[PDB]
Amino acid sequence: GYGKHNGPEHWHKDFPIAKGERQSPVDIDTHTAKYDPSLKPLSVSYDQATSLRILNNGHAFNVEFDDSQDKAVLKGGPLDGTYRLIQFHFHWGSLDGQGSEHTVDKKKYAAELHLVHWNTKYGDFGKAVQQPDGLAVLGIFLKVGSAKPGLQKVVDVLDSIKTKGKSADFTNFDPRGLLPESLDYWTYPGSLTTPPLLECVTWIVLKEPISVSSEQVLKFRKLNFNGEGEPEELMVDNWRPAQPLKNRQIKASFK
Numbered sequence: 399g400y401g402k403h404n405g406p407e408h409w410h411k412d413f414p415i416a417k418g419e420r421q422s423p424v425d426i427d428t429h430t431a432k433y434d435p436s437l438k439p440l441s442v443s444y445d446q447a448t449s450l451r452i453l454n455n456g457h458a459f460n461v462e463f464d465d466s467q468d469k470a471v472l473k474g475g476p477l478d479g480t481y482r483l484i485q486f487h488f489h490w491g492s493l494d495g496q497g498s499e500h501t502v503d504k505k506k507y508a509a510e511l512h513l514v515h516w517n518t519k520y521g522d523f524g525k526a527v528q529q530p531d532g533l534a535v536l537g538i539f540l541k542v543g544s545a546k547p548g549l550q551k552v553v554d555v556l557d558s559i560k561t562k563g564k565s566a567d568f569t570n571f572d573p574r575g576l577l578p579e580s581l582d583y584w585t586y587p588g589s590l591t592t593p594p595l596l597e598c599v600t601w602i603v604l605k606e607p608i609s610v611s612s613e614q615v616l617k618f619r620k621l622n623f624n625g626e627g628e629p630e631e632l633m634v635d636n637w638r639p640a641q642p643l644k645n646r647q648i649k650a651s652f653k
């Protein structure tokens with residue numbers, strides 16, 4: 399979890415890879431990122447996306463998709479091959495001034511959306527996480543301002559999954575409603591940002607944030623880390639701090 403006695407600063411004791419060479423998130427220093435003209439544009443094909451369910455797993459809430467066929471896929475950019483969307487989730491703060499996992503020149507956003515995809519050549523998500531190129535996660539920053547209409551269906555169902563382990567049917571949700579206008583991105587190799595912290599992720603972090611209203615993000619902060627009938631602990635600040643870049647270069651698709 400993310401408390402004072404089991405937060406990210408303790409994870410290394412159970413998951414020694416927490417101190418590894420390609421851990422995420424990181425600070426993106428925009429002046430030392432390298433423009434790489436050989437990076438292709440991202441290809442996001444989400445028209446046939448089939449959402450199934452939304453679940454409070456005690457760390458965040460996940461919206462899960464049917465990933466048994468190539469329905470919603472990410473290609474191009476720095477990627478070789480086809481990556482299927484399996485779930486998305488957010489990280490957010492107790493205050494608007496924090497919540498994102500990645501930072502841009504040390505600037506924190508109010509929240510960060512992760513669309514998680516796995517490389518179809520490995521057959522399933524479980525095998526993919528064991529490979530250095532197993533996952534691609536698209537990261538999108540949220541700043542507080544105008545409401546995001548395409549997010550509201552998610553906000554409205556949160557009441558039904560308040561506590562850990564609760565799930566609700568969540569069909570016909572279109573993830574295209576959560577993308578910014580521009581798909582310019584930074585990319586670097588990294589890890590999952592929750593345990594088991596495996597170093598299997600190609601990160602693709604979009605330069606343009608989306609805006610959500612204060613009321614929308616306030617509703618995220620009413621969820622609970624705990625299960626029903628346990629003492630209430632609000633689900634806030636479920637973000638891991640920036641880790642050292644070590645021997646990695648962040649590349650940019652844009653100048």
Ligand SMILES: [Zn+2]
Nearest residue numbers: 487489512591
């Ligand atoms: Zn995440």
